[PDB]
């Protein structure tokens, strides 16, 4: 059938971000067990992301920035206190124990998964530890240090001419877009909430520049988009983009922070709706890299990522969750699916239809 | 050239000015304002009737504290004008008498304010009105009752006032003096805070993503994040609609914002609503009868920077509409507000304090003890706090006398209601 | 809590409504509007006096064309109210009589409009009033005088109306029918045009830098560029202040603009001024008594696009202040306007025409011959032109009868006043 | 004294832009005579910009764009009608006869002048035919096709480490800033009118990104800045920038469209005020490349550029213009100086002072 590759290491669960931390990487392990407990592990191929060398990171990043990140330990923050302002590390995205070891694995799955994906080894590579997109060339933005998505895309361009990057998330992917804003080799379709949101970028008019003038698609959205609206905007836009662009290997960054009830996001997507997008992209039958970003409400994120793994395996998983290691977190419901909240969808059909027409118009200028 | 309707917007102004002038300098005027005079065309005194006729013809009403009684009675007997509404709101030790006055004159707004005051001070003051007090809630209900049984309720000991200092937030308790019962630390930076119904809501986190919201009261209960990233956004509580509003704010791009969002405690959702006419940042919020008043802050200037704003914006929550007042604030800059009765006691700069009644257009000033104050209203008392550790003072509105009333915090970031 | 001033903004409304109700349903009302009634408290007819009292008490005035005479006379004798101003503005073949009326009633606004009409039609109608006509200017002045000498002036033959078509602009001449005397081609794209005081000003050039301005009348006289780059910006002429205004516009960044700038023919300079409350693009401009009215256009919608606007903005030039009307236009979208007397004849969509009087709040509609019209006012006539080549029609305001009146242009881009 | 180099070819005067053209290159010849008639020619060294090869232009530009510009002649616009939209050539900046030959000389003076300037041959190079800054990497913007400023700066970086680019003009220099927006080797201080103006870029917050985060200084201005205000903002800002940056070779782009009475601009600078800036930059005694951009009102531009040449020669020129070839254009005044117009200066001292403080603050983060 559809060969699938999994990337996971246990130790990633011990990287405590800090007291009062929205980002909790250990959530992925609370996900891994749902793969084993449901039995998806046997049908799948499971690996662990190996260490990413400092030189490997010096493909899109600067040498000085990676050296700074590697040389900062929690005891010696005093020596580098001056450089913590030039690189935006220490406050919004504070430094903690084994930070570089954390990026040895968050990035180790993207490059090493794209290695198998570009080669004739798999049609779908999975890495829930990755999905970090806000990191800049020589700066840490958001909760990201090394941009695993950009490294994977660069590693993919060696084997493929045109690469489509789909950003299923609630945050605009700044690092990927700016990394490929002025090139036609990579088009970055990004579905994200726009306004007075974190990234600040991703305007409808940010359609590109230079040779890649019409190779930057952004779909701004408001808060609370339902499952139906997201799917009905996702399938045709993606189909039209591929028809006009002929991608060779697509990179889907799935962010479970798009689910309803996340502790940072404000979207209303359910697990079924979030898996509808991955299945839609599967219909086209192209190589699909899968980066798992965001992931802040650890229960909804764990359930969503396990379901996405099930979809990748084209298997069936019961709604009733089997008693797991962290069942106490799952609470009295015991359900694998989450009921959508009662929040209003601010994306009216006229707004969605107009943005879709603008995107189609911009796609008509594709050589 | 053949047919059109001519509507003179100045007809009312002209006729009012002319009637004022001719009447003052020399039945319709009164009958056009009061139904009872219309019906007829001892109870009131000559001095009070002078202000009554001045309001009838000219509409110029100033009060001194000793006449409210009549300014109530007459204004509820002679007419149903806005004078009665203003006097009753203004009236909103003396609780036991105002209860009887509101009951006898059927005022469903003064009655609840008086019941609140009577219930809060039931211990210090230990027929159907007593049952209403007991049913509302309470701290010796059974002892007061002894001094039926099912017509009683309890809420334990709700925190009167909260305050964030330096990072832990202290749950100050007011006892009829100050007490410190309650303490809880936070690991997060607090961009804004609001006290909903005896509970503390705090919004903040990292400065590029200051959306995390917590309900710490086991503390650290997570709540729905806001869909916007704004700093110094005014956070207001409206138990009337059970909604917490987040107005204004400054974006991370150094740009002021005019967006408004509101939370729902029951539904645990955030919903966007109408925008503000003028974008401001750091403005003080005041919820009066459901209408949000945004005072001061910073406003755009020189196309790239901000200047101390002195505007007053009004967000009508029932109609969800924003409008800017046609007049200006006495001062501008960093500001703090606290709702008391129908007033906002706004404090800014130094030795400056203004009692502002937004339904009308006038600002008063009270002398301070001539020392960055932060004000906070209680059930019936006003507490002023110094930004840096006397550390607390009690303001008597009638006499303007600052009387010194336990503080363990070096700094004072927030002083919630 | 002790002292505050209470100003009830609704006192005037309440008293006016009550006086209206009691008086209608059953001296102060009239004396508060008219000084002469105040002084006293045959000339007018009972029917006219009915509308007079309706204005005194209710202020509801609609006219039919046959009563203006009395609506003038009485409104200048009984009172100095806004009724007289409105009737005189509305009054602003019949020129020889309105001259005498304005002279006898000392109206310095109707008199100039009547002198303009009489001077323009002096050939078709061939003591001190005659000298005023001659001094103002004129086309047979000497022949009319024969039918003193130093009290005469001439301006040759000023172009009545201009029009840009397809790229050359034709200087259409009105003779009392249409004539084509004058023609000049342009090598530039015209973003906007404003025939000012008998001269043509055109602003445009390349679309990223559409600032070039020309005074082509030897043509191609260069003028001061504007400091902004905007498309579909409303260009208006104000000979009262000798200034040409450029309001609104859409930036090259697909973003609407609310900036306002004005030119000076005498000084040859452009100066920025107060901004518009709401940014619009493509709105039709109408200069009435120096106040600029911006009608329709496009307004921001969905945070990225534009929708047909139906707003009316007002720029007071004397005070340089902008404000949006509280009411709405009948329709929305691409629009064309032309000032006639104290009215604006606004044309949009198809078979739609509204006579809007901005000092008031009412819009009338006149039936069209049921065919993208463009309207243009003359000294006393209204000419409607089809966007594509009958090519021209004459609109009679009184009868609304479209009467067919030389066209050599396939297209019709601009039809200036 | 101060060795000066001049670059000029006569034929440049025959490149008719088109009917109703704001840009009239022949204006430079009406300038050249004022150099000869005043006698400044003898004391100076005069050369002509030689042809710029297609390969030379393919240093900052794309090969396809330069090939398109070279292969489009006025007779054959029909064949390339499709490509006239991808490269923004034909409408706002229409094609005319000998367009490529025009850029063979407008650019030939900048690279060949920087050749002498970087070497030990001159302290001041002059090229009034250059000054084209709006051209993009693969697009024609404004009235520019090949960005002579960017080519000259790149040719300068070979011999110098840090290069300061001062843009004395009324339009923001888009090509130069974006060409060096993300690098610390070149800081681009640009004094320009900002708002709803042509370029659309140059915001006070556009202070840079990446390694060149604090290496992009922009001073927004309104319309009608007087001589005194411009000088008092120019001298201290430039002094502070140089003190914090240590430039090795400065590139001054003087735009006579900044003069009062220009047919496109709206500044109120006089000839004396415009020469005050060049003399100020001379005080620092660093290599000064001089690119003459804009230049639309041909009389004021001719007088200003001849005076600037006189300043470069440190000579004295009488106000009374000698009867020249184009004296009829100069009109009854006969004066070499132009009286400033009566337009209002919208740049209040508080606004200017605040922007200067912001720029100083941003300069304090210079490593
Ligand atoms: Zn995300
Ligand atoms: Zn320029």
Numbering used by the authors:
A (entry chain D), D (entry chain B): 9 to 375
B (entry chain C), C (entry chain A): 32 to 57, 76 to 90, 105 to 155, 161 to 194, 204 to 215, 219 to 227, 243 to 261, 268 to 277, ...
What do the study's own words say?
Kelch repeat and BTB domain-containing protein 4 (KBTBD4) is the substrate receptor of a cullin3-dependent E3 ligase complex (CRL3KBTBD4). Recurrent indel mutations in the Kelch domain of the KBTBD4 E3 ligase rewire epigenetic programs for stemness in medulloblastoma by recruiting LSD1-CoREST-HDAC1/2 complexes as neo-substrates for ubiquitination and degradation. UM171, an investigational drug for haematopoietic stem cell transplantation, was found to degrade LSD1-CoREST-HDAC1/2 complexes in a wild-type KBTBD4-dependent manner, suggesting a potential common mode of action. The mutant and drug-induced complexes adopt similar structural assemblies requiring both Kelch domains in the KBTBD4 dimer for each HDAC2 interaction.
The best map at 2.7 Å was obtained for the higher affinity sample mixing KBTBD4R313PRR and CoREST1NT2-HDAC2. The modelled structure revealed a KBTBD4R313PRR dimer engaging two HDAC2 molecules in C2 symmetry (2:2 stoichiometry, Fig. 4a, b, although a rare 2D class with one HDAC2 (2:1) was also observed, Supplementary Fig. 4). The mutant KBTBD4R313PRR was resolved to near full length, consisting of BTB, BACK and Kelch domains, whereas only the histone deacetylase domain could be modelled from the full-length HDAC2 construct; density was also lacking for its associated CoREST1NT2 subunit. Each HDAC2 subunit in the 2:2 model makes direct contacts with both Kelch domains in the KBTBD4R313PRR dimer by engaging the mutant BC II loop from one chain (site 1) and the BC IV loop (blade IV, site 2) from the other. Most importantly, the indel mutation extends the length of BC II and shifts the position of KBTBD4 R312, a non-mutated residue, by 5.9 Å to the tip of the loop. This structural alteration allows the R312 side chain to insert into the catalytic pocket of HDAC2 to within 5.7 Å of the catalytic Zn2+ ion, which natively binds to acetyl-lysines in histone H3 and H4 tails. In addition, the R312 side chain is sandwiched between HDAC2 F151 and F206 to form cation-π interactions. Additional cation-π interaction is observed between KBTBD4R313PRR R314 and HDAC2 Y205 close to the exit of the HDAC2 catalytic pocket. Here, KBTBD4R313PRR L408, F410 and F411 from the BC IV loop form extended hydrophobic interactions with an HDAC2 cleft that features Y202, L212, P228, Y359 and I363. Additionally, the binding is stabilised by a salt bridge between KBTBD4R313PRR D409 and HDAC2 R230.
